Amino acid sequence: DFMLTQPHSVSESPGKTVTFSCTGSGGSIADSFVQWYQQRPGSAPTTVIYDDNQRPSGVPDRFSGSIDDSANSASLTISGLKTEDEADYYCQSYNSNHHVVFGGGTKVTVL
């Protein structure tokens, strides 16, 4: 089965940069678009990146998505970290049957 492997925590001080990845297992990351969601406790996820690297309207440009074909991975980078960025982030894509697959999630802690 196609799975997405994600580390579960990163932490930095305000103003710094964090990045974390989502690695494909059982399939190629490049075959399907990768999305990233931010999620706050008890609330629905909101899109921060769709279609590998696109930001919806209103998402600050300090959020950026990338794909590393050689590593079979997708990454989310948050520059100029803000206190309000402390939340959980999930990558998401699709398997060969067009069904949804989620990464395990990363908690960004702002110090």
XYZ file of N, CA, C and O in Angstrom:
444
model
N 0.836 -1.195 0.000
C 0.000 0.000 0.000
C 0.872 1.247 0.000
O 1.986 1.226 0.516
N 0.359 2.334 -0.568
C 1.090 3.599 -0.572
C 0.910 4.306 0.768
O -0.216 4.486 1.239
N 2.019 4.697 1.389
C 1.986 5.381 2.670
C 2.896 6.599 2.617
O 3.796 6.696 1.777
N 2.649 7.528 3.534
C 3.440 8.745 3.661
C 4.039 8.778 5.061
O 3.307 8.762 6.055
N 5.369 8.811 5.134
C 6.100 8.787 6.392
C 6.523 10.202 6.759
O 7.250 10.855 6.002
N 6.083 10.664 7.928
C 6.299 12.023 8.384
C 6.874 12.011 9.799
O 6.405 11.231 10.636
N 7.872 12.847 10.107
C 8.379 12.913 11.488
C 7.352 13.596 12.379
O 6.483 14.327 11.907
N 7.423 13.376 13.681
C 6.286 13.881 14.445
C 6.516 15.197 15.190
O 5.539 15.756 15.698
N 7.735 15.742 15.252
C 7.892 17.027 15.918
C 9.096 17.790 15.404
O 10.136 17.205 15.091
N 8.931 19.108 15.333
C 10.006 20.068 15.160
C 9.735 21.214 16.126
O 8.602 21.433 16.567
N 10.795 21.948 16.461
C 10.693 23.087 17.362
C 11.749 24.124 17.009
O 12.885 23.773 16.679
N 11.365 25.399 17.062
C 12.298 26.506 16.877
C 11.772 27.749 17.578
O 10.607 27.826 17.979
N 12.652 28.736 17.689
C 12.319 30.033 18.235
C 11.651 30.880 17.166
O 11.789 30.610 15.969
N 10.921 31.913 17.574
C 10.332 32.831 16.597
C 11.383 33.404 15.657
O 12.529 33.645 16.042
N 10.975 33.611 14.407
C 11.825 34.190 13.400
C 12.686 33.198 12.648
O 13.192 33.535 11.571
N 12.860 31.991 13.175
C 13.691 30.991 12.522
C 12.886 30.208 11.486
O 11.703 30.462 11.250
N 13.537 29.222 10.875
C 12.944 28.419 9.819
C 12.933 26.957 10.241
O 13.911 26.451 10.804
N 11.807 26.292 9.995
C 11.682 24.857 10.186
C 11.262 24.242 8.863
O 10.588 24.871 8.039
N 11.700 23.007 8.652
C 11.249 22.229 7.519
C 11.081 20.785 7.959
O 11.779 20.297 8.848
N 10.108 20.113 7.356
C 9.905 18.707 7.658
C 9.364 18.046 6.409
O 8.744 18.703 5.567
N 9.600 16.745 6.292
C 9.308 16.069 5.044
C 8.267 14.974 5.212
O 7.859 14.605 6.316
N 7.828 14.494 4.064
C 6.852 13.419 3.957
C 7.375 12.511 2.863
O 7.503 12.908 1.705
N 7.740 11.287 3.242
C 8.408 10.380 2.313
C 7.452 9.288 1.850
O 6.781 8.651 2.671
N 7.391 9.081 0.537
C 6.540 8.035 -0.005
C 7.109 6.651 0.265
O 8.316 6.421 0.186
N 6.211 5.725 0.591
C 6.521 4.315 0.791
C 5.520 3.508 -0.016
O 4.312 3.731 0.105
N 6.009 2.580 -0.838
C 5.108 1.805 -1.671
C 4.584 2.532 -2.886
O 3.546 2.146 -3.430
N 5.267 3.580 -3.324
C 4.857 4.327 -4.495
C 5.730 5.552 -4.630
O 6.494 5.900 -3.726
N 5.600 6.211 -5.778
C 6.397 7.397 -6.071
C 5.628 8.649 -5.671
O 4.487 8.835 -6.094
N 6.273 9.504 -4.873
C 5.686 10.775 -4.437
C 5.251 11.633 -5.623
O 4.311 12.428 -5.514
N 5.926 11.506 -6.768
C 5.670 12.400 -7.893
C 4.435 12.022 -8.703
O 4.021 12.800 -9.569
N 3.828 10.865 -8.449
C 2.698 10.432 -9.260
C 1.405 11.177 -8.945
O 0.490 11.178 -9.777
N 1.307 11.793 -7.773
C 0.092 12.459 -7.331
C 0.466 13.760 -6.633
O 1.555 13.888 -6.068
N -0.451 14.721 -6.670
C -0.240 15.995 -5.992
C -0.223 15.822 -4.477
O -0.997 15.038 -3.915
N 0.646 16.585 -3.812
C 0.769 16.578 -2.356
C 0.186 17.870 -1.784
O 0.481 18.971 -2.272
N -0.618 17.726 -0.734
C -1.228 18.826 -0.004
C -0.666 18.848 1.412
O -0.237 17.819 1.943
N -0.686 20.025 2.037
C -0.319 20.158 3.440
C -1.417 20.917 4.163
O -1.895 21.946 3.667
N -1.809 20.415 5.330
C -2.852 21.050 6.132
C -2.286 21.486 7.472
O -1.445 20.797 8.053
N -2.772 22.619 7.966
C -2.549 23.016 9.347
C -3.807 22.658 10.122
O -4.916 22.776 9.598
N -3.644 22.215 11.366
C -4.799 21.841 12.169
C -4.582 22.244 13.618
O -3.546 21.925 14.215
N -5.535 22.915 14.160
C -5.516 23.341 15.545
C -6.420 22.429 16.355
O -7.248 21.709 15.790
N -6.267 22.394 17.679
C -6.947 21.350 18.455
C -8.459 21.441 18.305
O -9.051 22.520 18.403
N -9.068 20.293 18.026
C -10.505 20.174 17.910
C -11.115 20.882 16.723
O -12.334 21.059 16.702
N -10.310 21.286 15.736
C -10.791 22.055 14.597
C -10.446 21.345 13.293
O -9.483 20.578 13.218
N -11.229 21.642 12.253
C -11.002 21.054 10.941
C -9.663 21.515 10.363
O -9.251 22.654 10.575
N -8.989 20.653 9.605
C -7.744 21.067 8.936
C -8.019 22.181 7.940
O -9.091 22.245 7.332
N -7.027 23.052 7.750
C -7.102 24.076 6.715
C -5.903 23.937 5.790
O -4.796 23.624 6.239
N -6.129 24.178 4.503
C -5.072 23.987 3.520
C -4.026 25.083 3.653
O -4.357 26.272 3.691
N -2.764 24.677 3.724
C -1.683 25.632 3.565
C -0.964 25.473 2.235
O -0.502 26.476 1.681
N -0.892 24.258 1.688
C -0.309 23.997 0.371
C -1.183 22.977 -0.345
O -1.609 21.984 0.254
N -1.435 23.200 -1.636
C -2.071 22.201 -2.484
C -1.279 22.091 -3.784
O -0.486 22.972 -4.125
N -1.467 20.978 -4.488
C -0.793 20.766 -5.769
C 0.718 20.974 -5.647
O 1.328 21.723 -6.421
N 1.300 20.345 -4.617
C 2.740 20.309 -4.348
C 3.283 21.592 -3.736
O 4.063 21.542 -2.773
N 2.908 22.745 -4.299
C 3.567 23.974 -3.867
C 2.697 25.220 -3.977
O 3.245 26.325 -3.881
N 1.380 25.098 -4.157
C 0.514 26.262 -4.331
C -0.099 26.673 -2.997
O -0.567 25.823 -2.231
N -0.107 28.008 -2.723
C -0.763 28.522 -1.518
C -2.156 29.016 -1.858
O -2.325 29.751 -2.846
N -3.174 28.619 -1.098
C -4.486 29.253 -1.228
C -4.390 30.729 -0.866
O -3.449 31.168 -0.204
N -5.404 31.488 -1.277
C -5.497 32.890 -0.889
C -5.510 33.012 0.629
O -6.222 32.275 1.315
N -4.692 33.926 1.155
C -4.646 34.194 2.577
C -3.550 33.470 3.337
O -3.241 33.869 4.468
N -2.956 32.425 2.763
C -1.849 31.731 3.428
C -0.577 32.560 3.252
O -0.233 32.914 2.115
N 0.131 32.895 4.333
C 1.310 33.766 4.208
C 2.407 33.114 3.384
O 2.580 31.894 3.392
N 3.194 33.952 2.699
C 4.227 33.380 1.846
C 5.390 32.772 2.617
O 6.295 32.229 1.979
N 5.386 32.825 3.952
C 6.406 32.108 4.707
C 6.200 30.593 4.698
O 7.101 29.859 5.130
N 5.061 30.107 4.208
C 4.823 28.677 4.020
C 5.163 28.315 2.581
O 4.653 28.942 1.644
N 5.997 27.291 2.402
C 6.356 26.855 1.056
C 6.448 25.339 0.986
O 6.967 24.692 1.903
N 5.954 24.786 -0.122
C 6.009 23.357 -0.381
C 7.015 23.030 -1.469
O 7.255 23.831 -2.383
N 7.620 21.850 -1.362
C 8.567 21.390 -2.371
C 8.467 19.877 -2.505
O 7.889 19.190 -1.662
N 9.059 19.366 -3.581
C 9.123 17.938 -3.866
C 10.572 17.623 -4.201
O 11.194 18.348 -4.986
N 11.107 16.557 -3.602
C 12.460 16.058 -3.869
C 12.309 14.671 -4.486
O 12.169 13.682 -3.762
N 12.336 14.607 -5.820
C 12.160 13.336 -6.522
C 13.173 12.296 -6.067
O 12.819 11.135 -5.824
N 14.445 12.687 -5.969
C 15.486 11.719 -5.641
C 15.247 11.076 -4.285
O 15.563 9.893 -4.092
N 14.697 11.831 -3.336
C 14.409 11.310 -2.009
C 13.010 10.723 -1.901
O 12.656 10.203 -0.836
N 12.207 10.809 -2.965
C 10.818 10.357 -2.936
C 10.020 11.070 -1.849
O 9.191 10.458 -1.167
N 10.255 12.369 -1.684
C 9.672 13.073 -0.551
C 9.071 14.408 -0.963
O 9.372 14.966 -2.020
N 8.195 14.903 -0.098
C 7.668 16.254 -0.180
C 8.022 16.946 1.121
O 8.139 16.293 2.161
N 8.211 18.262 1.074
C 8.566 19.002 2.276
C 7.702 20.240 2.421
O 7.277 20.844 1.433
N 7.455 20.608 3.676
C 6.877 21.895 4.028
C 7.926 22.686 4.794
O 8.546 22.164 5.730
N 8.106 23.941 4.412
C 9.032 24.846 5.081
C 8.269 26.066 5.575
O 7.426 26.619 4.855
N 8.541 26.468 6.813
C 7.927 27.644 7.406
C 9.074 28.564 7.780
O 9.852 28.245 8.686
N 9.217 29.670 7.065
C 10.228 30.657 7.413
C 9.626 31.696 8.351
O 8.405 31.824 8.466
N 10.503 32.432 9.035
C 10.057 33.458 9.960
C 8.960 32.991 10.898
O 7.891 33.605 10.961
N 9.216 31.891 11.610
C 8.204 31.255 12.445
C 7.545 32.267 13.379
O 8.205 33.142 13.946
N 6.226 32.161 13.510
C 5.465 32.986 14.434
C 4.829 32.107 15.495
O 4.596 30.915 15.286
N 4.552 32.716 16.652
C 3.885 32.004 17.737
C 2.614 31.319 17.250
O 2.311 30.185 17.640
N 1.862 31.995 16.378
C 0.597 31.455 15.894
C 0.776 30.248 14.974
O -0.201 29.535 14.719
N 1.999 29.985 14.495
C 2.257 28.820 13.653
C 2.315 27.518 14.430
O 2.341 26.440 13.814
N 2.335 27.582 15.758
C 2.355 26.371 16.558
C 1.042 25.621 16.375
O -0.035 26.124 16.734
N 1.133 24.428 15.789
C -0.014 23.625 15.392
C 0.502 22.328 14.801
O 1.720 22.151 14.674
N -0.414 21.440 14.420
C -0.095 20.200 13.732
C -0.207 20.410 12.231
O -1.075 21.152 11.764
N 0.687 19.760 11.482
C 0.703 19.854 10.028
C 0.703 18.449 9.449
O 1.524 17.616 9.851
N -0.205 18.187 8.509
C -0.321 16.879 7.865
C -0.087 16.999 6.367
O -0.688 17.854 5.710
N 0.774 16.141 5.819
C 0.795 15.981 4.375
C -0.268 14.976 3.948
O -0.729 14.141 4.738
N -0.653 15.058 2.680
C -1.738 14.227 2.172
C -1.576 14.064 0.671
O -1.218 15.016 -0.025
N -1.833 12.854 0.179
C -1.829 12.629 -1.256
C -2.776 11.483 -1.586
O -3.754 11.264 -0.856
N -2.504 10.748 -2.663
C -3.422 9.731 -3.156
C -2.641 8.498 -3.567
O -1.507 8.596 -4.049
N -3.268 7.342 -3.373
C -2.719 6.087 -3.865
C -3.178 5.832 -5.303
O -3.911 6.627 -5.901
N -2.755 4.692 -5.864
C -3.031 4.402 -7.270
C -4.517 4.235 -7.556
O -4.925 4.318 -8.721
N -5.334 4.012 -6.529
C -6.783 3.937 -6.679
C -7.486 5.266 -6.404
O -8.712 5.282 -6.232
N -6.737 6.369 -6.362
C -7.255 7.711 -6.145
C -7.806 7.915 -4.738
O -8.570 8.852 -4.503
N -7.417 7.072 -3.788
C -7.893 7.194 -2.420
C -6.896 7.972 -1.574
O -5.692 7.948 -1.829
N -7.417 8.651 -0.550
C -6.642 9.622 0.220
C -5.682 8.906 1.156
O -6.039 7.905 1.793
N -4.456 9.428 1.257
C -3.447 8.942 2.193
C -2.892 10.136 2.962
O -2.536 11.154 2.354
N -2.841 10.023 4.286
C -2.295 11.060 5.153
C -0.948 10.649 5.726
O -0.756 9.498 6.141
N -0.036 11.609 5.795
C 1.109 11.459 6.664
C 0.700 11.453 8.124
O -0.395 11.878 8.499
N 1.614 10.983 8.974
C 1.301 10.856 10.381
C 1.192 12.171 11.119
O 0.670 12.187 12.230
N 1.688 13.256 10.543
C 1.591 14.581 11.126
C 2.836 15.006 11.880
O 3.536 14.197 12.499
N 3.095 16.318 11.864
C 4.187 16.931 12.605
C 3.647 18.062 13.463
O 2.943 18.947 12.958
N 4.000 18.060 14.740
C 3.678 19.189 15.600
C 4.829 20.185 15.564
O 5.972 19.838 15.885
N 4.533 21.407 15.145
C 5.485 22.507 15.217
C 5.306 23.201 16.561
O 4.232 23.737 16.858
N 6.352 23.186 17.377
C 6.363 23.898 18.645
C 7.227 25.140 18.494
O 8.372 25.057 18.039
N 6.677 26.293 18.860
C 7.387 27.561 18.787
C 7.903 27.882 20.182
O 7.137 27.856 21.152
N 9.202 28.159 20.286
C 9.877 28.287 21.582
C 10.118 29.738 21.974
O 9.231 30.584 21.845
